[PDB]
């Protein structure tokens, strides 16, 4: 739930979102941050301030 991406991408949250990448050698591993962020609707950020 994109409203709560900063929650569901925080290790301290036990209800964290779960992503797994099974490499092509069968080894399971857990996501990269970039892939985690891929699964939400596109996040724009540009601080015009300075």
């Amino acid at each position: 739930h994109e409203a709560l991406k900063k929650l569901e991408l925080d290790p301290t949250n036990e209800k964290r979102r779960r992503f797994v990448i099974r490499q092509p050698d069968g080894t399971l591993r857990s996501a990269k941050m970039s892939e985690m962020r891929a699964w939400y609707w596109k996040e724009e950020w540009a601080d015009f301030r300075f």
């Binding site: 994109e2 409203a3 900063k6 891929a38 699964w39 609707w41 596109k42 996040e43 724009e44």
Partner: protein, 203 residues
């Protein structure tokens, strides 16, 4: 919803951008920065700016919430006979949920799920649920049934105090029982010779 021509639920959550072949705009080698803004990021109407449902376009009070606080006391009333139905059902299902396969904890689960259902577990739903975990020797569970009865701030009737007290017997902890004594089964007085034995139901 699903597998009709117009699938909705697969777009209902967020899938990254599939660039596997020319789905029309040479999606697979053409990388499509501006094509996404103008074209595939949905819009507020034809031509309006790209609406971004992003995870940074939601208000920062959304992350700072504790759990289940959005949930308000829901006082749900159900017909009388419908009360009876669902009562006998969560009773039957604390006694036995699945036929032969249950873990002991299915009463406990069914007591809670009675709670989460915004239901009022009667004392019979407590007696039952305490017997069925005593039988199974899940006494820490027959205790947490006490604690559920207590977090409910409920008044264990004589039957229920006897029940939990058996549990203290079997687990062998005097403390566990001393508080039930201190709390509830103190104003219990033996039947003095003059007074009526089974004082009638009153309310």
């Amino acid at each position: 919803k699903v597998d009709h021509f117009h699938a909705n639920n697969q777009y209902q959550h967020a899938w990254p951008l599939l660039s596997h072949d020319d789905l029309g705009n040479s999606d697979q080698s053409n990388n499509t920065r501006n094509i996404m803004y103008s074209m595939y990021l949905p819009k507020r109407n034809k031509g309006t700016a790209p609406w971004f449902r992003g995870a940074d376009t939601y208000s920062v009070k959304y992350c700072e919430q504790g759990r289940y606080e959005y949930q308000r006391y829901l006082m749900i009333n159900r017909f009388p006979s419908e009360y009876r139905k669902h009562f006998m059902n969560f009773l039957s299902n604390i006694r036995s949920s699945s036929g032969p396969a249950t873990i002991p904890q299915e009463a406990l689960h069914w007591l809670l799920r009675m709670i989460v259902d915004n239901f009022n577990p009667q004392h019979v739903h407590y007696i039952a649920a305490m017997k069925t975990l005593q039988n199974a020797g899940e006494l820490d569970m027959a205790r947490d049934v006490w604690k559920i009865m207590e977090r409910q701030q409920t008044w264990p009737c004589t039957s229920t105090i006897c029940a939990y007290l058996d549990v203290c017997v079997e687990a062998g902890e005097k403390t566990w029982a001393m508080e039930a004594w201190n709390r509830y089964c103190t104003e219990l007085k033996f039947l003095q010779p003059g007074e009526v034995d089974p004082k009638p139901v009153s309310r």
